[PDB]
């Protein structure tokens, strides 16, 4: 298939990016350090809520470092106009780049949370290996999906711009807005209104931020204190179940990939 033949390039081109391997080893040496400090103090719902915030700062960062120069980095490099004269479509050299860069994030978090589990089973004596594999299996198949959202965000902001220096400004803008501005605008809206703006609409704004849907998935079982959540304490007021919370994260991929294809179709 032609979708895999261009995936084998990006799987072998993203792994030679030295800026990726720096901040993907930084994700590995921090997920062990949080889990080592989480083992000497004991707690259990605090070491889950800190890993999900660690992958909130880094799995959008590795996704936006990969794919900000996916379309416009090939357009000004000349190799995009050449590629359309190969037997391909615009839907195959985009979905092929998404599978190729998606297996890197599926491997960058399998390295990160993989050694984090071995720094718990060899550190916390008497831990439940069934509960460890299930909780960190929920961390593995949902930090990819958070990564695949910001991968699909970067294909939107690469097809729209026409210069790679302006694509790096927008990719830094998307990383600042979704990670640590939308969590602070919702915080500043709740303090200044003292929770009396809307008592039923305000938990639904967590679903308009995929990092907040990511944090709500992993903190489903390990609730604990309220300040362990903080802004995520609104998620107990959401009447939606857990299975739809998986489905709105998959729907955040498919809308922002169909937007990435409809932009690229009129490039």
């Amino acid at each position: 298939n032609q979708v895999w033949n261009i995936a084998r390039k990006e799987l072998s081109d993203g792994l030679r990016n030295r800026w990726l391997l720096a901040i993907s080893l930084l994700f590995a040496v921090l997920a062990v350090g949080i889990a080592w400090l989480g083992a000497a103090a004991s707690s259990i719902p605090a070491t889950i809520a800190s890993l999900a915030s660690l992958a909130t700062f880094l799995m959008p960062l590795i996704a936006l470092l990969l794919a900000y120069d996916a379309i416009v980095g090939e357009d000004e490099g000349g190799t995009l106009m050449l590629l359309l004269t190969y037997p391909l479509g615009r839907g195959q050299i985009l979905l092929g780049k998404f599978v190729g860069h998606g297996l890197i994030l599926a491997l960058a978090v399998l390295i990160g949370f993989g050694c984090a589990a071995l720094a718990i089973a060899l550190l916390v004596e008497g831990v439940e290996l069934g509960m460890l594999f299930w909780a960190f299996g929920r961390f593995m198949i949902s930090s990819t999906l958070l990564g695949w959202v910001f991968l699909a965000f970067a294909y939107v902001l690469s097809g729209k711009v026409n210069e790679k220096s302006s694509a790096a400004g927008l990719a830094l803008g998307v990383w600042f807005l979704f990670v640590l501005v939308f969590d602070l605008v919702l915080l500043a809206l709740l303090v200044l209104s003292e929770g009396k703006f809307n008592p039923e609409l305000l938990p639904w704004l967590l679903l308009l931020n995929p990092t907040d849907i990511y944090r709500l998935i992993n903190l489903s079982g390990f609730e604990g204190s309220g300040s362990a959540m903080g802004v995520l304490s609104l998620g107990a007021d959401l009447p939606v179940p857990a299975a739809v919370l998986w489905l709105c994260l998959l729907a955040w991929i498919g809308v922002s990939l169909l937007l990435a294809y409809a932009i690229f179709r009129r490039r």
């Binding site: 081109d13 030679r16 000349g78 190799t79 106009m81």
Partner: peptide, 13 residues
């Protein structure tokens, strides 16, 4: 076969 104008292809490959 198409040889384009300026192709700095893939600098890490």
């Amino acid at each position: 076969g198409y040889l384009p104008e300026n192709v700095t292809f893939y600098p890490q490959l």
